[PDB]
Symmetry: C4
Subunit: 388 residues, 4 copies
Amino acid sequence: RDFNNLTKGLCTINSWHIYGKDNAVRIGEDSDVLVTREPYVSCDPDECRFYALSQGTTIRGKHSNGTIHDRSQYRALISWPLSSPPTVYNSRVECIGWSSTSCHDGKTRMSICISGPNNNASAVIWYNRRPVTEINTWARNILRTQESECVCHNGVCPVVFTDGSATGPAETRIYYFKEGKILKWEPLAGTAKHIEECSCYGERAEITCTCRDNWQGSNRPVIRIDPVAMTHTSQYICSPVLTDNPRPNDPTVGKCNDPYPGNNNNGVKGFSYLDGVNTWLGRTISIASRSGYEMLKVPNALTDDKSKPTQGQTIVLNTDWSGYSGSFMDYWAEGECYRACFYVELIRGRPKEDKVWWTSNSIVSMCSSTEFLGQWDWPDGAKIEYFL
Amino acid sequence: RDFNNLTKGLCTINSWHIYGKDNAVRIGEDSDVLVTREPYVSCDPDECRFYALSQGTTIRGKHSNGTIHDRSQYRALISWPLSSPPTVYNSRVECIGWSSTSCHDGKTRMSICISGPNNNASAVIWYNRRPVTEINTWARNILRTQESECVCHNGVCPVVFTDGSATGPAETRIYYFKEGKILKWEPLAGTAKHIEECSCYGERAEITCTCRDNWQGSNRPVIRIDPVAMTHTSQYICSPVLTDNPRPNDPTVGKCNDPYPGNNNNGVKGFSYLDGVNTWLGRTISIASRSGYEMLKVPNALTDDKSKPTQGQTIVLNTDWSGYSGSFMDYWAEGECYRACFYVELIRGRPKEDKVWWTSNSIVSMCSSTEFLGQWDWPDGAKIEYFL
Amino acid sequence: RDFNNLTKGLCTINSWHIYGKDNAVRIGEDSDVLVTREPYVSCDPDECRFYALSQGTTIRGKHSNGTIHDRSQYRALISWPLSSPPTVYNSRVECIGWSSTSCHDGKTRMSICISGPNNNASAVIWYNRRPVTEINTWARNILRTQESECVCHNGVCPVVFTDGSATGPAETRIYYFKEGKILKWEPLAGTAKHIEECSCYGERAEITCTCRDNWQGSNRPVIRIDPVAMTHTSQYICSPVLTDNPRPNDPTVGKCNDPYPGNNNNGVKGFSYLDGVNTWLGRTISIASRSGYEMLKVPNALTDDKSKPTQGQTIVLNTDWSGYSGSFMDYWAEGECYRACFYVELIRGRPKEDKVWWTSNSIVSMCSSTEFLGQWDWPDGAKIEYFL
Amino acid sequence: RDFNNLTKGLCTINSWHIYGKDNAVRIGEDSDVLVTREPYVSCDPDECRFYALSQGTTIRGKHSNGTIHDRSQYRALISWPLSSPPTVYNSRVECIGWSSTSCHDGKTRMSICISGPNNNASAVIWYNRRPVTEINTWARNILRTQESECVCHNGVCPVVFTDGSATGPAETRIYYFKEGKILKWEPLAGTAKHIEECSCYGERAEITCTCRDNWQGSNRPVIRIDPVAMTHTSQYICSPVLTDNPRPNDPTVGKCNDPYPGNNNNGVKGFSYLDGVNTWLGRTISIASRSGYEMLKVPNALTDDKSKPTQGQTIVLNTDWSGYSGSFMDYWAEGECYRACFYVELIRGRPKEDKVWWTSNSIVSMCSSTEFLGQWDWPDGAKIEYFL
Ligand SMILES: *[C@@H]1O[C@H](CO)[C@@H](O[C@@H]2O[C@H](CO)[C@@H](O[C@@H]3O[C@H](CO[C@H]4O[C@H](CO[C@H]5O[C@H](CO)[C@@H](O)[C@H](O)[C@@H]5O[C@H]5O[C@H](CO)[C@@H](O)[C@H](O)[C@@H]5O)[C@@H](O)[C@H](O[C@H]5O[C@H](CO)[C@@H](O)[C@H](O)[C@@H]5O)[C@@H]4O)[C@@H](O)[C@H](O[C@H]4O[C@H](CO)[C@@H](O)[C@H](O)[C@@H]4O[C@H]4O[C@H](CO)[C@@H](O)[C@H](O)[C@@H]4O[C@H]4O[C@H](CO)[C@@H](O)[C@H](O)[C@@H]4O)[C@@H]3O)[C@H](O)[C@H]2NC(C)=O)[C@H](O)[C@H]1NC(C)=O
Ligand SMILES: *[C@@H]1O[C@H](CO)[C@@H](O[C@@H]2O[C@H](CO)[C@@H](O[C@@H]3O[C@H](CO[C@H]4O[C@H](CO[C@H]5O[C@H](CO)[C@@H](O)[C@H](O)[C@@H]5O[C@H]5O[C@H](CO)[C@@H](O)[C@H](O)[C@@H]5O)[C@@H](O)[C@H](O[C@H]5O[C@H](CO)[C@@H](O)[C@H](O)[C@@H]5O)[C@@H]4O)[C@@H](O)[C@H](O[C@H]4O[C@H](CO)[C@@H](O)[C@H](O)[C@@H]4O[C@H]4O[C@H](CO)[C@@H](O)[C@H](O)[C@@H]4O[C@H]4O[C@H](CO)[C@@H](O)[C@H](O)[C@@H]4O)[C@@H]3O)[C@H](O)[C@H]2NC(C)=O)[C@H](O)[C@H]1NC(C)=O
Ligand SMILES: *[C@@H]1O[C@H](CO)[C@@H](O[C@@H]2O[C@H](CO)[C@@H](O[C@@H]3O[C@H](CO[C@H]4O[C@H](CO[C@H]5O[C@H](CO)[C@@H](O)[C@H](O)[C@@H]5O[C@H]5O[C@H](CO)[C@@H](O)[C@H](O)[C@@H]5O)[C@@H](O)[C@H](O[C@H]5O[C@H](CO)[C@@H](O)[C@H](O)[C@@H]5O)[C@@H]4O)[C@@H](O)[C@H](O[C@H]4O[C@H](CO)[C@@H](O)[C@H](O)[C@@H]4O[C@H]4O[C@H](CO)[C@@H](O)[C@H](O)[C@@H]4O[C@H]4O[C@H](CO)[C@@H](O)[C@H](O)[C@@H]4O)[C@@H]3O)[C@H](O)[C@H]2NC(C)=O)[C@H](O)[C@H]1NC(C)=O
Ligand SMILES: *[C@@H]1O[C@H](CO)[C@@H](O[C@@H]2O[C@H](CO)[C@@H](O[C@@H]3O[C@H](CO[C@H]4O[C@H](CO[C@H]5O[C@H](CO)[C@@H](O)[C@H](O)[C@@H]5O[C@H]5O[C@H](CO)[C@@H](O)[C@H](O)[C@@H]5O)[C@@H](O)[C@H](O[C@H]5O[C@H](CO)[C@@H](O)[C@H](O)[C@@H]5O)[C@@H]4O)[C@@H](O)[C@H](O[C@H]4O[C@H](CO)[C@@H](O)[C@H](O)[C@@H]4O[C@H]4O[C@H](CO)[C@@H](O)[C@H](O)[C@@H]4O[C@H]4O[C@H](CO)[C@@H](O)[C@H](O)[C@@H]4O)[C@@H]3O)[C@H](O)[C@H]2NC(C)=O)[C@H](O)[C@H]1NC(C)=O
Ligand SMILES: *[C@@H]1O[C@H](CO)[C@@H](O[C@@H]2O[C@H](CO)[C@@H](O)[C@H](O)[C@H]2NC(C)=O)[C@H](O)[C@H]1NC(C)=O
Ligand SMILES: [Ca+2]
Ligand SMILES: [Ca+2]
Ligand SMILES: [Ca+2]
Ligand SMILES: [Ca+2]
C-alpha cells in the first residue's frame, strides 16, 4: 500500500442520501449495547467503521448512571462495523481515554486518545495499533482534540488539539504526524480566537477543518491546512447563516475574522463543506438546544459575509434530539471525486431527558448525491418511557 | 475474479431438500435476535448468507411493539451467516431502508436499499460496500423493489422497481446496473399489468423473474430479461394452478396475457422455476391467508393454460404460517447445472397472532435434488404463548 | 492443498491429557448457549472445532422444554471454536437435521445431515459448504449415521449409515464419498449383527469404527474399512471388558463374532482405539446408566477373548453424568504419529434430572500422552438447582 | 516468519502511559462477561491480547458463587482482544487448567496450562494451537507456573515452574522449550530460596524474571536466564524498597541473597524492570493488603542494597483494590528499543468484598514513555452495591 494523497476534489453536492444509521438506543433497550457519546465515522481502504467514546458500561447496566459526565477512567475510543450498534461483543477498542481522533493514511491507521485528570492529561498516539508517541498537557487544562476523523496526505496527518480554558483564550496546536511520530507542531495562527472539536476533510492537497469557538463565536472557526508545507490559516465562516449552538438568530451580515457574538461559553461540534458554490453547512435547527439538524447550501459561505441559503435538507426534525456532527469521506472510493459525508450524534438521556440516569447516543450518517433526492428525517427512534 | 456468466441450465428438479433454517423466533425468545421481515438468501462466490430487513429492535425488546409496520427509519438490509438467526451481534448492515435487493456479480456485491417517506423515496445503489448511484422516486408513491436477490450476467445486474399505486397502474422500471452504475433503464413492456416484488433466477444467459400483480392478478406475472441485449418481455404464468395469495380457487384454464381475476389489491411475494417440463411453482396452501406452503411440479406452466400438477412437495403445513417466498441459486457451485433454491418467510406475530405486539419471521430454505426425496414439513417452531 | 493420507500409526497411549472442555451448561445458566446433544470434535488442517446437534433454542429459553426429544425440524449440525460453549452468536450451522457426521479431507470439509420424519428421512451431503448429493431412506425407519467425525484417505471418506429397526436386524450401509459424491456403497458384511453410531479413526490406510449394537450386544461391533479398496470387515470387540451401556457385569470371556447378551434394545455411542497392546477402551463406569466414564488399557481387546485391563484412567466419576463418547484425531498435527483423542458428552437434564424440562450437554475431550500423567475427573460442573 | 530474537534494549522509562483497560466488572454487571482471575497480556506479531484464567461461568451467573477458589475443572486459559472484556462470545480458549503461561516465538504461540488435583497435576504444552508435550507433577503438590507471559529467543522459550510447598522449600524448574518440545530443564540455582509466579521480559538476549518468594521473602527473587546457553542465575532484588505484599515497612538496607524477613507464607505476583538507572519496580501501596499500586524508579534496585526511589507514578489509589501484576512487551513493535509494559489485576469481590459470592477482576495495563507524562489513577470502577 502507498500513502493516500488528496488528489481529488469534492463531488457536486445536490442532496444527501442515507449512509448509515445504528439505532443503538432502540436496540440497546434489550441488548448489550455500550453507552457512548462523541461518535464519528472513519474509513480504511477496505471498510468504513463507526467510532465513539465508550463509557465502559452498557445502557441497561447499572453503571449507566452518571454517564452524562464527559471524562472518566472508564472511557475508550471504540470502533465497530458501519451501522451496527456499539456492543460489548463487536466493539474494538482503539485506545483508552476521553478525547480522540483517528484516521487511516492509506497504509495503516493512526488513533489518538487523551486521558488523565484535567490538570495532567496526556495524548497517546497509536499507529498500526501500537503506541508510538505521547504528548503531555502543555496548559494543564483538559488537553483535548477533534472528536472526529483526521485526514492524511502522503502520510502526513494533521491533528488539532486545544489545551486551556473553554471560556477564554486557550492554547491550540496543530500537530503534523507521520507514522505516529511528530514531524512538526505549530500554534494556532490566523483570526480564529478559540478552537475546539475540529471536523476535517481533505481535497486537492488541502485539509479544511470547521471547528467550535466555545468562548465567543456563534459562527464557526475554519482552519485550512497545507499538509505538504505543514502550515495553516484560520478564520471564521463569514456567512450570516450561523451554525454553532446555542446561537443568536441569524443576522444579515456575518463576520469573517472575529466571533459573531451573542452567546458565550458554549457550543457544539459541527462541520461544513466549503467549496465555493458547492458549499453546505450543517446546523441544529433550534437556536437554543441540540434539537434538529439541517443541511443548508450556502454558496461561498466561507468568504461572503451576506451569503444565504439556496437549498437545503432536513436531517433531523426540530422535535428530535441531535448532538455533535462531523465530516468524513471515503478517500478510497472509486471515481473522479470525493463524496462528502457527515454524521449526526443523536443524544438521548441527560440532560434533556432526565427521567433516565444515563446519557448515550445513536448515529445517523449521510453522504452527498449529485441527484436531487427526496428527504426524510432520521431520528434516534427510541422511546425513553421504555427505559423507566 | 471475473464476472459470473449464466452459462448453465437448471438441474432437473425431482424433489427439494433442506438447505437452511434459522429458527430465529424460537431462539429470539431468549437471545438478542433482531425483528425482521422480507428475508431472502443470496450467495457470494465463497459463502451463502441470509438477508432481511431489520426493524432496528430485538424481538424481546420493547421497541418490537409496532413492527407490523413496513416502513420506518429504523429498518436496514442486513445479512448474516446461513442458518444462524439475525442477531444484534452477527448481522452485517448492507444499507439503510425498507425495500431492498442484493446480488453478487462474481467480483463483488451490489446492494440496493430504498428509504424515505412515501412521496419522496430514493434508492441508493451500493457496490463493493460503497454507495455509487442514487435514484429518486419517479411516481412519488413508495418506490420499491424486489425483496430478494437480483441476478448478474457478465457484470450486468437487472433490477425491477415499481413506483406508484399498489391498486391500479403503476410505473415499473427495469434498471440494468454494472458496477453499481446505470447502464440503461426500460419501462415495463409486455402484458403484465402490475408488478411488485420480483423473484429472479438466471440460466443460459436469461433472467426469469416471477412477480406479484397486486392490483388484479392471482396468476403471477413473469418478466424475462436478456441481460446482454438489456431487453425484456412480460406475461403471466398461463397455468390454472394459481400461485398468488389470497386467490380464488383454481380454475381449469388460466390466463397467459392478463391477470386471472377474483381477488384485488392484495398478494404475496412468490416465485417459480419455469423450465419446460422441469417447472415448479410455489404457493401458499391456503387460498385466503399466508398459511402453508407447497411446491407443485406443473409442466409448461408458463405457456400451457391448462397445465396441472404432476408431482408436489409440502414445505409448510396449512396449519403453520408462511409468508413471502423467493428464488436464489448458488451460481458458484461445482457441476454442470445450477441447482434451483428457494426460501419461505415464516411470519409470526401480527396480524394473525395478535396476542403479541410484534411481527417477525424465521426462514426456511430448500434446494432441488435430482433424487425423489422424502418430504418433511418445516414450521417456524416458536410457541407464541412463551412471548406473553 | 492435497488430500490427506493416513500415513502414520497411533502414538503410544500411556495416559490421557485434557484437550478441551466447554463448560456449556454452567455458562449457559446465564448466557445465550444453545441446547445441544450428540456432540463431537473434528479437525480441519488449521483448526479443531466442537460440533453438535443444536435443538434450536437456548437452554434458558422457554423452548428448551421438550428437548429430551431426538428429532425435530429445529435441529442442526453446528460447529464452534474448541472449548468455547455453543452459543447463538459463535455457532456455525453446517447443515440442518437430526443425525450427522463431518470430516475434512485435507482440501475441504464434508458434512452430512439427515432430516425428515421417521418414515421418509433423507441425508444431504455437503462438501465445501455446498450441498452436493442426497440419499433417500432405503428402509423407511430413521435413516441415521455416526454422530461423530468421519475419516478420509486420499479423498475417500467412508461413512456408516443405518436405516431400519433399532430392536432387530436393520440395513446398514457403508458409503464411500469423494468430494461429496458417492463412489460406491456396500451393505454391512461380517459378523456384527446390528450397527449404530460408529466412532471412527484412521491409521496407516485403514479406518476403524467402534459402534453400538443396540439390538443385542453389550460388546461393541467394530467395522474396519480399507478406503483404497473400498471394502470392509466387521466383528465385535472380543474382550470380556464390555463397553456398551447398559450392560451386564463383565464376564471372563467375551465374544468375537456375536453380541454378548444380557441387555437388549439399548446402548450408548462409544469408541475404542484398537492397536494391539496399545489398545484402550472407553466405557461408562455404571453398568446401568450413563454415569461415569473411564478409559481402560486392554491389550489386544479386539482379538483376545479373555483380555483384561492392565492400566486405566478415570475421566468422569460415577457420581457424575456422562453420555455419548467418540473418537477423533488431528490428522494435521506435527510429528511421526497420530495422537488418539476422544470426547465425552456430559448429559444434563432429562431424563435423569427431571426437575428441569430440558436436556442438554457439555463436552470434555482428551488426547493421549506418551507420559504417564496424573488423572483428574472432569464433570459437567453445573448445579441443576440453579436452573429451577 | 523467523523466530524473534531479543536484539534490542529497553527504552528509557520516564513515565507510564495507559495501554489497555477492559472495565470488565463494570461491563459484566449487565453483559455476559466471564469470571476470571490471574490475567496477563501477551503480544503476537500482529496483535496484542489479554489473557486470563476463566472460572467457567459469567459474573452474573449463579455459578459465580465459589469463584474465590483457585483450582477447579472449570478453569481455562482464555485470550481476548486488547481492552475488550472477557466475554463468553469473544474469548478464545487456549487450553484447560488453572495455572498458565503463553508466549509467541515469532512464528507461532506456545501456551501452557496445568490441571489436575493437587497431588497429581500435569502441564500440557501447546504449540501452534495443538498439544505437543506433557509434564507430570514431580513433587505432587500443586505444579504451577508463571501466570504471565513467557519470553522467547531464537525459538527457545524458558518457563519457570514450581512444584512443592508454598510455605517451605519447593522444587522449581526452568524448562527450555522450542516448538513446544523440551530442549532441557534445570533445577533452580542461585540464592533465591523460593519461587512462584515469575514475571518475565527479554532484552539483548537475556530474560529477566521477577518472582514471588511466598515462603519468607518480602523482597522479590529475580531469575536471569540466558536462553542461548540455557542457563540461569537467581538472587533477590537488593533494594530496601520492598515489593511483595503483605510486607513489612521499608528498611534502609535490603538483602541481595536471602529473603527479607517479616512476613511468611504469603505474597502476590509482581514484576520489575531492572536496567541500571532505568529500573522501575511495581508494588501495592498497602503493606497489608492488595490495595493500590505504584511504580517507583529505583536506580540499580537489583544490585544496590540501599537504593531508594528517585521518581514514581501512582497507578491505582490505595483506596482501590489491586492484585497480581506482571510484565510483557511488544517484541514486534517498530523502533530501536523495547517498550516496557505491565498490567495490574484489579480484583473485585471475595475475600475483601464479601457481600458478593464471587471473585473476579478487571485489567489495567500501561507501557513506558520517554516523556514525563502526567499521572491518573485507574481503578476497576465497578460499584459492588449494584451486584447485590
Ligand atoms: C421531497 O424532497 C425534496 C428535496 O428535499 C423537498 O424539496 C426541498 O424542500 C425544502 C423545504 O422547502 C427545501 O429547503 C429549503 O430551501 C430553502 C432555499 O430555497 C428557497 O430559496 C431559494 C433562494 O431564493 C433566493 O435567492 C434566489 C437566487 O439564488 C432568488 O431566485 C430568490 O428570489 C430568493 O431571493 C431573495 O432572497 C435572497 C437572500 O435570501 C436575495 O439574494 C434575493 O435578491 C432575494 O431577496 C430559492 O432559489 C428556492 O427556489 C427554488 O426551489 C424551490 C423548491 O424548494 C422551487 O419551488 C423553486 O421553483 C426554485 O427552484 C427556494 O425558494 C431554504 O431557505 C430553507 O431553509 C430555511 O428554512 C428552513 C425552514 O423551512 C429553516 O430551518 C432554515 O434554517 C432556513 O431558514 C432560516 O435561515 C435563513 C437564513 O439565515 C433565514 O433567512 C430564515 O428566516 C430562517 O431563520 C430562522 O430559522 C433558523 C433555523 O431555526 C434560525 O437559526 C434563525 O435564527 C431564524 O429563526 C430550506 O432549506 C429544499 O431546498 C428543497 N429541495 C429541492 C431540491 O427542491 C420537497 O419539498 C419534498 N416533497 C415533499 C412533497 O415533501
Ligand atoms: C414420502 O415422501 C414422498 C415424497 O414427497 C411422498 O410422496 C409424495 O406424496 C405427495 C402427496 O401425495 C405427492 O404430492 C401430490 O402430487 C400430486 C400429483 O401426483 C398425482 O397426480 C399425478 C398426475 O396425474 C394426472 O396426470 C397423469 C399423467 O401425467 C395421469 O397419469 C393421471 O391419471 C392423472 O390424469 C388425470 O388428471 C390430469 C389433469 O389433472 C389429466 O391430464 C388426465 O387426463 C386425467 O384427468 C400422477 O401422475 C401421480 O401418480 C404418480 O405418483 C403417485 C405418488 O404420489 C404414485 O402412487 C403413482 O403410481 C404415480 O407414480 C399422482 O396421482 C399433486 O396433484 C398433489 O397436489 C394437489 O393436492 C394437494 C393436497 O394433497 C394440494 O395441496 C395441491 O395444491 C394439489 O391440489 C390442488 O390443486 C390442484 C390443481 O389446480 C387441484 O386440482 C386440486 O383440486 C387442489 O385444489 C385445491 O387445493 C388448492 C390448494 O389449497 C386450492 O388452491 C384450490 O383452489 C383447491 O381448493 C400433491 O402435490 C408427491 O408428488 C409425492 N412424491 C413422490 C415422488 O411420489 C410420500 O407420500 C411420503 N410417504 C409417506 C409414507 O408419507
Ligand atoms: C495419580 O494418577 C495416576 C495415573 O492416573 C494414578 O494411577 C492410576 O491409578 C488407577 C487406579 O488405581 C489405575 O487404574 C486401574 O488400573 C487397573 C489395572 O492395573 C492393575 O492391574 C494390572 C494388571 O494386573 C494383572 O496383570 C498383570 C500383568 O499384566 C499381573 O502382573 C498382575 O498380577 C495381575 O494379574 C492377575 O490378573 C490378570 C487378569 O486380570 C491375570 O492375567 C493374571 O495372571 C492374574 O490373575 C497391574 O499390572 C497393575 O499394577 C501396576 O500398577 C500399579 C499402579 O496402579 C502399581 O502399584 C504396580 O506396581 C504395577 O506397576 C495394577 O495392579 C485397572 O484394573 C483398574 O480398573 C478396574 O477397576 C476400576 C475401579 O478402580 C473399575 O472402574 C474398572 O472398570 C476396572 O474394574 C472392573 O473391570 C474389570 C475387568 O472386567 C473387573 O475385573 C473388575 O472387577 C471391575 O468390574 C466391575 O466394575 C465394572 C465397572 O463398574 C463393571 O463393568 C463390572 O461389571 C464389575 O462390576 C483401574 O483402571 C491406573 O492404571 C493408575 N495408573 C498408573 C500409570 O499407575 C494414581 O493413583 C494417582 N495418585 C493418586 C495419589 O491419586
Ligand atoms: C502531574 O503528574 C506528574 C507526573 O506523574 C506528577 O509528578 C509526580 O509527582 C509524584 C508525587 O509527588 C512523584 O512521585 C513520588 O516521587 C518521589 C521521588 O521524587 C522525590 O525524591 C527524589 C529523590 O530525592 C532524594 O535523592 C535526590 C538525588 O537523586 C536528592 O536530590 C534529594 O535531596 C533526595 O535525597 C535524600 O534522600 C535520599 C535517599 O532517599 C539520599 O540519597 C539523599 O542523600 C537524601 O537523604 C527527588 O529527586 C525528587 O525531586 C525532583 O522532583 C520533584 C517532583 O516530584 C521536583 O519538585 C523537584 O524539583 C525535583 O525535580 C522528589 O523530591 C517518591 O519518593 C515518591 O514515592 C514515595 O512516596 C509515596 C507517597 O507519595 C509512596 O507511596 C512511595 O511508596 C514512596 O514512599 C515510600 O517508600 C519510600 C522508600 O522506602 C519511603 O522512604 C517512604 O517513607 C514511603 O514508605 C512508606 O510507604 C510505603 C508505601 O505505602 C510503605 O511500603 C513503607 O513501608 C512506608 O510506610 C513518589 O513516587 C513523581 O515522581 C512526580 N513525577 C514527576 C516527573 O515529577 C505531578 O505531581 C502531577 N501534578 C499534579 C498537579 O497533580
Ligand atoms: C464472462 O464472459 C465475459 C465475456 O466473454 C468474459 O470476459 C472476458 O474476460 C477475459 C478474462 O478476464 C478478459 O481478458 C476479456 O477482456 C473479457 N472479455 C470481455 C468481452 O469482457 C469473462 O471472463 C467471463 N467470466 C468468467 C467467469 O469466465
Ligand atoms: Ca460557540
Ligand atoms: Ca394478487
Ligand atoms: Ca447394546
Ligand atoms: Ca512473600
